[PDB]
């Protein structure tokens, strides 16, 4: 993985309607000065933000290891099926954005 970017698992999350859908974004913070973003990714190829690690049906909750994050959609719907991704925005010592590969929801 070039540039050490965050990950986004599972690649294909399948959930029935009604129950929750939880992706998990993994970002090991070398910098300790970072902000996560959680995107939905329209077939128009447009990128809309849904929540963040520095914080609605969309939650970003930090897990104990500090490298893994949960990204939960409560009361999921059929019109929530799509492609998602997360991106890490480091501010210091190096200003950068590193974004995971897209994962699908059904």
């Amino acid at each position, epitope marked *: 993985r070039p540039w050490n970017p965050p990950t986004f698992s599972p690649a294909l999350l399948v959930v029935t309607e009604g129950d929750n859908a939880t992706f998990t974004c993994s970002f090991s913070n070398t910098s300790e000065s970072f902000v996560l973003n959680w995107y939905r990714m329209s077939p128009s190829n447009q990128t809309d933000k849904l929540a963040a690690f520095p914080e609605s049906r969309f939650r970003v909750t930090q897990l104990p290891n500090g490298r893994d994050f949960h990204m939960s959609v409560v009361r999921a719907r059929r019109n929530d099926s799509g492609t998602y991704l997360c*991106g890490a925005i480091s501010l210091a010592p190096k200003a950068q954005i590193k974004e995971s590969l897209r994962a699908e929801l059904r």
Partner: antibody
């Protein structure tokens, strides 16, 4: 549509200061964007000056030659970025662009990825 | 304290040629590819052609290509079209964004 408009250029006298403004429109100062300043002396090449992080933390990034003589900041009530240019000298006579880096969906972003540019404003340091 | 050296200073080429501009950094750029190539035309703001770390959706023509790692980078134009005669600048970033700087520029002119 996305746009950056520089303003505040013109004549300035050697030793005096000048503040430039970059009026952004069509987008918000989200968590994914940096506003930068690049200048170009007549006939010479591009020279990176400084960037400021749009969003809460407002981190500043300066070029070594510009540290101590330039100050970048943003307006809190609007979507504007300023460049305070102190102790100006003839070598500073240049066109000053403001550019933008960052976004979402392009994989990796650094301050070397300036994909939105204004038309630049001319500053003439002379008495 | 990085310096980016662009070779050659200028080159004269004909439409349809294959040109190669190079950019060499005194110190390695961040993660060995934090370098971007920009195109500028007289009176005009610059435009980002290649970002070495990621492929672009801007609509940059495919004939433009970036290559290289560490300190030596190359911009290649497979089939030079009339709309390409301009000046090309490389921009390198480092571990400290204070070291970021542009190259000297390569002015690509028409051969007649």
């Amino acid at each position: 549509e996305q746009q950056l408009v520089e303003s505040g250029g013109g004549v300035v006298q050697p030793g005096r200061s000048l503040r430039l403004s970059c009026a952004a429109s069509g987008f918000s100062f989200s968590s994914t964007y940096w506003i930068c300043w690049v200048r170009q002396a007549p006939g010479k090449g591009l020279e990176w000056i400084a960037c400021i992080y749009a969003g809460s933390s407002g981190n500043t990034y300066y070029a070594n030659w510009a540290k101590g003589r330039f100050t970048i900041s943003k307006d809190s009530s609007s979507t504007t970025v300023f460049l305070q240019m102190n102790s100006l000298r003839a070598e500073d006579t240049a066109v000053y662009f403001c550019a933008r880096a960052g976004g979402a969906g392009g994989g990796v972003y650094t301050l070397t990825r300036l994909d939105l540019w204004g038309q630049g404003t001319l500053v003439t340091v002379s008495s | 304290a990085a310096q980016l050296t662009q070779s050659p200073s200028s080159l004269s080429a004909s439409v349809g040629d294959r040109v190669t501009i190079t950019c060499q950094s005194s110190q390695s750029v961040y993660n060995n590819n934090d370098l971007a190539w920009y195109q500028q035309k007289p009176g005009k703001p610059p435009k980002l052609l290649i970002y070495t770390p990621s492929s672009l959706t801007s609509g940059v023509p495919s004939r433009f290509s970036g290559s290289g790692s560490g300190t030596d980078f190359t911009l290649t134009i497979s089939s030079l079209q009339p709309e390409d005669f301009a000046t090309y600048y490389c921009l390198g970033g480092y571990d400290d964004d204070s070291d970021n700087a542009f190259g000297g520029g390569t002015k690509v002119e028409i051969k007649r």
